[PDB]
Design a protein around this nucleic acid. Structure first.
Ligand SMILES: Nc1ncnc2c1ncn2[C@@H]1O[C@H](COP(=O)(O)OP(=O)(O)OP(=O)(O)O)[C@@H](O)[C@H]1O
Ligand SMILES: Nc1ncnc2c1ncn2[C@@H]1O[C@H](COP(=O)(O)OP(=O)(O)OP(=O)(O)O)[C@@H](O)[C@H]1O
Ligand SMILES: [Mg+2]
Ligand SMILES: [Mg+2]
Ligand SMILES: [Zn+2]
Lengths: 43, 615, 511
DNA sequence: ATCTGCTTTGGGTGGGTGGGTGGGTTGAGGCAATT
DNA sequence: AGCAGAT
C-alpha cells in the first residue's frame, strides 16, 4: 500500500449469494485476487 | 443482596410519562410537535420543562384523576428518568414528513444489511442508543411556577459549592458561581462498532464508564457454530460519539464564609450543551449531581471516598457633547475637565494609519497621569478601564489589551523587564516571545494609560519635572500627552472637595444637580460609533498644522534654553497633534478636519503640562 | 483523667474516650463517602441494597468492603444503581496541635489527626481553639504485612470525633447587656474604657484611645458603582527603644477577639497571603491561608515593621490597598478575602528619632505604604525628672505583684468540657463585642460641618505636620467619628464624635 | 482448557546499592557572583 | 481484575 499502515480503508466483498465479507487493505480495495489471498491467509 | 419496598413503581411513572408526552397541550401537543421536528432531522435536542409536568399534574388533579408526583420523583432521582423518557420518546417517534437520503447515512445501510442477514439466517439487534439522534435535558422547576401552584422548587433554588453536600447526590440541583476553566470539546464514545474479518458480521458494545475493555474475539452465531476464530477490530466510522467537555465552577467572593478559601466543583457537558460555558461567566448551572466511581486497582485503593461531578442540563447566563461625556466619565470625583477630555480622546483613538511605505505612524494616543499622592489617579484609571471594552487593569495582561487601551497603575515602580516590554510595544506594536518551549509572535496595537508618582513621592518645585520623573526621557517623549496633576491646598477648593466626598459618604449618590450625567450605555455606543468612522484632511489644514509646528518648535527651543522646560518639541509632537486632531474629528463625525479640532488639540497639549507647571 | 492534650496522648489511652485541646492547623477538603447503595432490577421489579463499612466509619472491626457497585443480581439480572436512593455521608480530616505556650522547654508542639463525619464536617477552621471528644484508635496492619520490610514502624492512630467545642465569642446575658447600656450612658465612657486598656503601661493615653477605636472599627460601605470603602482603622507606632510598643501590640493581641502575631524577619510574602500545597486525603491542589487571610474580619499585629524586605512589603501593600489577595500560581486563579486591621510598630532609621531631620529621613518605609495608615504615632523617650520618677514608681509597683494562691518566693506555673474605676478585661471584651455587633451609626449634617471645617483648616495651615495632609485624612476623620459613635452605642454620629476624632487626629499630626 | 500468581494506578501503608533524559513543582535557606 | 506461565 502506498499510504501508511494506519490509513484505514475498509472493504465489503459480495459473495455469489447476498452476503458481504470485510477485508482491510488498499490492495484489496483495488483487486480481488489479493482480497481472496488475504481472506485465506487471515485464517 | 437483600431487598427493600420503596413507595415508587416505575410502571405507573412510565405510563404517566407516555400520557404526558402524547396528551399535554399548551395547535397540537407541544412535545409531539417537538418530536415531529426531531424526526425530520431539524431538531437534535429535546428539553423537558418541569413546569409543564407540574401543570399537567395539576390539570389531572383538577379533572379528579389524581396521579403520581412526577416532578418530585424526577428531582429526587433524575438519572433513571433520562432513560425512561428516552424510551418513551423512542416508542412514540412519529414518521418523517420530509423525504431524506437514507442511503447516504452509513448506519441506515449497515442496519439494512443486518436485517437482510438475519432474514437469510432465519430462512435457513443494536442498542437503542445507537440510532438515537437527539439528546434529552431537564429544565428545572421555575420559582414563579412553583409559587403559583404552592410548591417548593429545590431544583431551581440556587446553591453555592459549599452547600452541595454528600446527601444531594443523585438529585437535580442548581449551582451558582463563576466558571474558571473549560476544556476543549472532544469525542466521548457511547457505542463501539466492531467488525469480523471472517464472518462478515458486526458487533456493538456499550460504554458507560471512564474505561472499557475492547472485544478481541468474534461472538457472532456463525463464528461460534463454525468455531472459526475471527478477530474483532474497531471501526470509528460506525461508532457513536457524543461531544464531551469538562468545566470547573468556583464560589463567588460573597458566598465564602469569613476566614475561608473558595471551593470548586467539576461539571460535565454532553451533547448540544457544549460550548455554552466559557471562563469568567457567572452562571446558574442546573445538572444531576452524581459520583464518579474509580475502576480497577484505583477503586480498591481509593476506599469509600468518591469523586463527584455535575451533569449539565440547563445554563442561565447573567448580564456640548464633549463636556457632557467628560463630566459623565467619572461623576464621583471632583471635576477635571482637561484630564477627562484627554482620556476620552485616548478612548476613541482616532487615527489614519495607512502609510504603506514600509511602516506607519502609530495608531494609538497614549496618556500618562503623574501626580502627588492624594489626587484621584486610581479612581480615574478604574473608571476609564471599566468603560472601555478592552480595558485591562494591572499594577506595576498586555495580551488581553491588544487593540485596546491598557490600564497600568503604579507605572514608576514597574520592573525593567516590563519597561522594556512596553518600550517594544510602543515602538513596534508587537509582542515577541523567544523561548525553546514556544516561539509565538503576536501583534499589539494597544494604547497605554499609566499612573505614577514623582521620584521623592511628591512633586518638588525646586527640581524640574525631568528630575522628578524617574522614567527615561525617551519614554516620556514617546507619550502622546503627558498630564501632571498637583495637589495645591486652597480654602475654597478644599471646602468643595470635602463637601462632595462627605455628601457621597452620607447619601451614597452623586451630589451634583446642575447637570444630569449621560447614561453610560449611550456614551459607550457613541464611542464605538466614533471608532468606526474615518475622517480626512486637506492641504489647507496641512499648512495650518505645519505653521503651528514651527511656532511650537521655536517656543519649545526658547523654553529649553532654560531648565524649566519638560522637553523640546520634536516630530513626535507633530504626529501627536495630528493624531489628536483626527480623533477630535472622529468625535465630530465629519470627514473634513476643521481648524477648530486642531486648535482644541493644541490647547489640550498646552494645558497638559504648562497650565499646572506655571502655577 | 481522660482530659488530655496531643502531647499527653500515649499508647496507654488507645480504645478509650478522650478529650483533647489544641489549635487546628490543617483541614482537608470535604469529600462524600459511600455507605449504602440501592439498585433496581428492571425485570424482577424489586430493589436491592448493599452496605459498606470502613475502619473509620465504625467502632467495631469488620471485613473491608471495596466500593465496587454490584452489577448483576443473584440470578443474573442486570442491576442499575439508584444514586438518588443511595446514602453518602461527608468526611473530613483535621489536625489539632498542642498549644505553643503549654509546651515543655525546648520542644516544638505536637499534633494528632482527627476525623469528623456527617454534621461535624465544617465546624472548625485553621487557627481556631477547639476541644475535641472522641475515641482513640489504631488502623491498618502497621507493618505486620510482609510487604513492608521495615520491622521498626508502629501503627497509625487517630481520633474519631464525637463533639467539637469552640474556645471565640462570649455569650451575653441580659444582666451584661443592661450593665453595658448603663455604662454607655456615662459622659466619660471613652476615657474609662481607654484607661482600662493595658493598666500596667504608664501613660500613652492617646495610643490607648486609638487602639480602642481600632477594636471597635468603623462602618463598611460599598457603593453600587463599585467603590468599596473600608471601615477598618490601621495604626503605626514609631519611636525610640523601650517605649512599650511591643507590649501594646501584645495586649491588643490578647484582648482582641481575633488577632494574629507576626514580625518582620520571621514572616515572608507567601506566609502572609497563602501557600500552595497538596491535600493528603485526596491529593488535590489547594491553598492554605496565611497570616493576613487567617485574620479576616480581625486584627494583625506586625512587630518590627521596618525590618521587613521590599518583596514581603509588597504583599502587605496590596492587602492594605485592596483588602483582598489575588493568587496566580500552579494553575490557580482566585481572590481571598483579607479584611483586617493592621497595627504595627517600627523603629526610626538611626534607632532613635531625630528632631532636626525631617520625618522622611527618619522613617525608611515608602510614602505610599505610609499613606495607608489612619494614625501615625511618633513617640519619643524624653528624659524628665517628674516623668522618670512617676514611671519608675509605676514599674516598681508592677514588679511587686503576687498572684493569689501563691506564697512569697514561689515561682509561677479543666474540670468540665461541656460547660474612674477600671473596667475588667472580660467586661471590656463583652462591651466591644456588643458595640461592634449591634450598632451601625449614620452621619448627620452637624458632624458633617465639623468634619469639613476641620479638614479645611488642617490642610491649609502653616504649621508643619508629621504626616502630609491628604484626602485620605477626610476618610480617616469620618472613620474615627463613626467608631467613637459606636463606643457610645449610638445610631447617629453627632458633634461630640467629630470633635473627638478631630482632637485625636490633631494630636497624631501636630503632637 | 484450567489453575497459580504479580501488579498497578501513581504515591510515600515500596523505596534510596535504580536514579532524575521515568513524572509527581512551590517554599525556604545557603552560597557564589554580581553588585 | 488482566494478563503471563506450568500441569
Ligand atoms: N477630586 C476628588 N474627589 C473625591 N475623592 C477624591 C478626589 N481626589 C482624590 N480622592 C480620593 O482620594 C483617595 C486616594 O486616591 P487614589 O487612591 O485614587 O490615588 P492616590 O492616593 O494619589 O494614589 P497612590 O495609591 O498611587 O498613592 C481615593 O479615596 C479618592 O476617592
Ligand atoms: N511606659 C511603660 N510602662 C511600663 N513598662 C514600660 C514602659 N515603657 C517600657 N516599659 C518596659 O519596657 C520593657 C521592654 O520594652 P518594649 O519591648 O515594650 O519596647 P519596644 O518599644 O517594643 O522596644 P524596641 O524598639 O526595642 O522593640 C517592658 O518590660 C516594659 O516593662
Ligand atoms: Mg493610586
Ligand atoms: Mg519591640
Ligand atoms: Zn465472525
Amino acid at each position: 500500500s502506498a499510504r501508511h499502515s494506519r490509513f484505514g480503508g475498509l472493504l465489503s466483498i459480495q459473495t455469489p449469494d447476498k452476503t458481504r465479507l470485510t477485508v482491510s487493505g488498499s490492495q484489496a480495495l483495488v483487486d480481488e485476487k489479493i482480497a481472496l489471498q488475504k481472506l485465506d491467509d487471515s485464517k | 443482596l437483600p431487598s427493600i419496598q420503596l413507595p415508587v413503581d416505575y410502571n405507573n411513572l412510565f405510563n404517566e410519562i407516555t400520557d404526558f408526552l402524547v396528551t399535554f397541550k399548551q395547535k397540537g401537543p407541544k412535545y409531539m410537535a417537538m418530536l415531529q421536528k426531531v424526526a425530520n432531522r431539524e431538531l437534535n435536542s429535546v428539553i423537558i420543562d418541569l413546569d409543564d409536568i407540574l401543570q399537567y399534574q395539576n390539570e389531572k388533579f383538577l379533572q379528579g384523576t389524581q396521579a403520581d408526583d412526577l416532578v418530585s420523583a424526577i428531582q429526587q432521582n433524575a438519572n433513571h428518568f433520562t432513560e425512561l423518557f428516552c424510551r418513551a420518546i423512542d416508542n412514540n417517534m412519529p414518521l418523517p414528513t420530509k423525504e431524506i437520503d437514507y442511503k447516504d447515512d452509513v448506519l441506515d445501510v449497515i442496519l439494512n444489511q443486518r436485517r437482510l442477514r438475519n432474514e437469510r439466517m432465519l430462512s435457513d439487534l443494536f442498542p437503542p442508543n445507537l440510532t438515537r439522534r437527539y439528546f434529552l435535558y431537564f429544565k428545572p422547576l421555575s420559582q414563579n411556577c412553583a409559587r403559583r401552584y404552592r410548591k417548593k422548587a429545590i431544583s431551581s433554588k440556587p446553591l453555592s459549592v459549599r452547600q452541595i453536600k454528600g446527601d444531594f447526590l443523585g438529585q437535580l440541583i442548581t449551582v451558582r458561581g463563576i466558571i474558571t476553566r473549560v476544556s476543549d470539546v472532544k469525542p466521548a464514545v457511547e457505542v463501539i462498532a466492531y467488525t469480523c474479518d471472517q464472518c462478515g458480521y458486526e458487533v456493538f458494545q456499550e460504554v458507560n464508564s471512564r474505561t472499557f475493555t475492547p472485544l478481541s474475539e468474534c461472538t457472532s452465531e456463525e463464528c461460534s457454530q463454525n468455531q472459526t476464530k475471527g478477530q474483532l477490530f474497531m471501526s470509528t466510522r460506525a461508532s457513536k460519539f457524543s461531544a464531551f467537555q469538562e468545566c470547573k465552577i468556583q464560589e463567588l467572593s460573597q458566598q465564602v464564609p469569613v476566614g475561608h478559601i473558595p471551593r470548586s466543583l467539576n461539571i460535565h457537558v454532553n451533547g448540544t450543551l457544549v460550548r455554552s460555558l466559557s471562563p469568567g461567566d457567572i452562571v446558574d448551572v442546573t445538572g444531576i449531581f452524581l459520583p464518579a466511581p474509580y475502576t480497577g486497582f484505583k477503586a480498591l485503593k481509593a476506599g469509600l471516598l468518591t469523586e463527584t461531578y455535575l451533569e449539565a442540563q440547563f445554563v442561565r447566563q447573567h448580564k456640548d457633547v464633549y463636556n457632557r461625556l467628560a463630566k459623565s466619565i467619572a461623576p464621583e470625583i471632583y471635576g477635571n475637565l482637561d484630564v477627562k477630555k484627554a482620556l476620552l480622546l485616548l478612548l476613541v483613538g482616532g487615527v489614519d494609519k495607512r502609510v504603506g511605505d514600509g511602516m506607519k505612524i502609530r495608531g494609538d494616543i497614549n496618556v500618562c497621569l503623574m501626580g502627588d499622592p492624594g489626587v484621584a489617579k486610581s479612581q480615574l484609571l478604574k473608571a476609564i478601564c471599566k468603560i472601555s471594552p478592552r480595558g485591562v487593569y494591572t499594577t506595576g495582561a498586555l495580551v488581553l489589551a491588544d487593540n485596546g487601551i491598557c490600564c497600568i497603575d503604579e507605572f514608576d515602580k514597574m520592573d525593567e523587564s516590563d519597561r522594556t516590554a512596553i518600550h517594544e510595544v510602543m515602538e513596534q506594536q508587537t509582542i515577541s516571545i523567544s523561548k525553546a518551549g514556544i516561539n509565538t509572535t503576536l501583534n499589539a496595537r494597544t494604547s497605554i494609560l499609566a499612573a505614577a508618582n514623582p521620584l521623592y513621592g511628591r512633586y518638588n518645585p525646586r527640581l524640574s519635572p525631568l528630575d522628578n520623573i524617574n522614567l527615561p526621557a525617551a519614554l516620556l517623549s514617546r507619550f502622546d500627552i503627558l498630564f501632571l496633576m498637583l495637589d495645591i491646598p486652597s480654602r475654597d477648593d478644599d471646602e468643595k472637595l470635602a463637601e462632595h466626598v462627605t455628601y457621597v459618604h452620607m447619601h451614597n449618590k452623586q451630589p451634583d444637580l446642575d447637570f444630569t450625567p449621560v447614561e453610560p450605555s449611550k456614551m459607550r455606543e457613541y464611542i464605538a460609533y466614533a471608532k468606526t468612522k474615518r475622517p480626512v484632511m486637506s492641504e489647507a489644514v496641512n499648512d495650518y498644522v505645519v505653521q503651528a509646528y514651527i511656532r511650537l518648535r521655536q517656543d519649545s527651543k526658547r523654553e529649553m534654553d532654560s531648565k524649566f522646560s519638560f522637553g523640546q518639541a520634536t516630530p513626535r509632537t507633530l504626529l501627536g497633534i495630528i493624531r489628536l486632531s483626527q480623533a477630535l474629528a472622529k468625535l465630530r463625525l465629519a470627514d473634513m478636519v476643521d481648524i477648530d479640532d486642531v486648535e482644541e488639540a493644541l490647547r489640550l497639549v498646552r494645558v497638559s503640562k504648562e497650565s499646572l507647571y506655571q502655577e | 483523667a481522660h482530659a488530655l492534650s496531643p502531647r499527653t496522648l500515649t499508647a496507654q489511652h488507645l480504645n478509650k474516650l478522650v478529650s483533647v485541646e489544641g489549635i487546628v492547623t490543617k483541614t482537608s477538603l470535604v469529600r462524600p463517602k459511600l455507605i449504602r447503595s440501592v439498585h433496581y432490577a428492571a425485570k424482577t421489579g424489586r430493589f436491592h441494597y448493599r452496605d459498606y463499612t470502613d475502619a473509620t466509619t465504625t467502632l467495631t472491626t469488620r471485613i473491608p468492603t471495596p466500593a465496587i457497585y454490584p452489577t448483576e443480581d443473584t440470578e443474573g439480572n442486570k442491576l442499575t444503581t439508584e444514586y438518588g436512593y443511595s446514602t453518602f455521608i461527608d468526611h473530613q480530616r483535621i489536625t489539632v496541635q498542642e498549644m505553643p505556650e503549654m509546651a515543655p522547654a525546648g520542644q516544638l508542639p505536637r499534633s494528632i489527626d482527627v476525623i469528623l463525619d456527617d454534621d461535624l464536617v465544617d465546624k472548625t477552621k485553621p487557627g481556631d481553639r477547639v476541644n475535641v471528644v472522641g475515641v482513640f484508635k489504631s488502623l491498618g496492619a502497621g507493618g505486620m504485612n510482609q510487604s513492608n520490610s521495615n520491622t521498626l514502624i508502629g501503627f497509625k492512630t487517630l481520633i474519631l470525633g464525637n463533639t467539637v467545642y469552640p474556645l471565640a465569642r462570649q455569650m451575653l446575658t441580659d444582666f451584661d447587656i443592661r450593665n453595658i447600656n448603663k455604662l454607655s450612658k456615662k459622659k466619660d465612657i471613652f476615657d474609662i474604657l481607654s484607661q482600662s486598656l493595658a493598666p500596667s503601661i504608664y501613660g500613652h493615653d492617646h495610643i490607648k484611645k486609638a487602639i480602642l477605636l481600632m477594636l471597635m472599627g468603623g462602618v463598611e460601605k460599598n457603593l453600587e458603582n463599585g467603590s468599596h470603602l473600608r471601615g477598618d482603622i490601621n495604626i503605626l507606632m514609631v519611636g525610640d527603644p523601650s517605649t512599650a510598643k511591643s507590649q501594646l501590640l501584645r495586649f491588643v493581641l490578647n484582648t482582641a477577639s481575633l488577632a494574629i502575631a507576626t514580625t518582620g524577619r520571621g514572616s515572608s510574602g507567601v506566609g502572609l497571603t497563602a501557600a500552595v500545597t497538596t491535600d493528603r486525603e485526596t491529593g488535590e491542589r489547594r491553598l492554605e491561608a496565611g497570616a493576613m487571610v487567617l485574620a479576616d474580619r480581625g486584627v494583625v499585629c506586625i512587630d518590627e515593621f521596618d525590618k521587613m524586605t521590599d518583596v514581603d512589603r509588597v504583599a502587605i501593600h496590596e492587602v492594605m490597598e485592596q483588602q483582598t489577595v489575588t493568587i496566580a500560581k500552579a494553575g490557580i486563579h482566585t481572590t481571598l478575602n483579607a479584611r483586617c486591621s493592621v497595627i504595627a510598630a517600627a523603629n526610626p532609621v538611626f534607632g532613635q528619632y531625630d528632631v532636626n531631620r525631617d520625618p522622611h529621613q527618619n522613617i525608611a518605609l515608602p510614602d505610599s505604604l505610609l499613606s495607608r495608615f489612619d494614625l501615625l504615632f511618633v513617640v519619643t523617650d524624653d528624659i524628665n525628672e517628674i516623668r522618670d520618677r512617676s514611671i519608675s514608681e509605676h514599674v516598681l509597683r508592677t514588679h511587686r505583684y503576687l498572684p493569689p494562691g501563691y506564697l512569697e518566693g514561689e515561682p509561677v506555673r479543666s474540670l468540665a468540657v461541656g460547660e474612674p474605676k477600671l473596667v475588667t478585661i472580660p467586661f471590656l471584651r463583652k462591651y466591644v463585642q456588643y458595640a461592634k455587633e449591634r450598632v451601625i451609626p449614620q452621619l448627620t449634617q452637624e458632624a458633617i460641618n465639623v468634619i469639613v471645617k476641620n479638614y479645611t483648616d488642617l490642610r491649609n495651615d502653616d504649621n508643619t505636620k508629621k504626616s502630609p495632609i491628604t484626602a485620605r485624612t477626610l476618610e480617616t476623620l469620618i472613620r474615627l467619628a463613626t467608631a467613637h459613635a459606636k463606643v457610645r452605642l449610638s445610631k447617629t454620629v453627632n458633634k461630640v464624635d467629630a470633635k473627638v476624632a478631630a482632637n485625636l487626629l490633631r494630636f497624631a499630626l501636630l503632637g
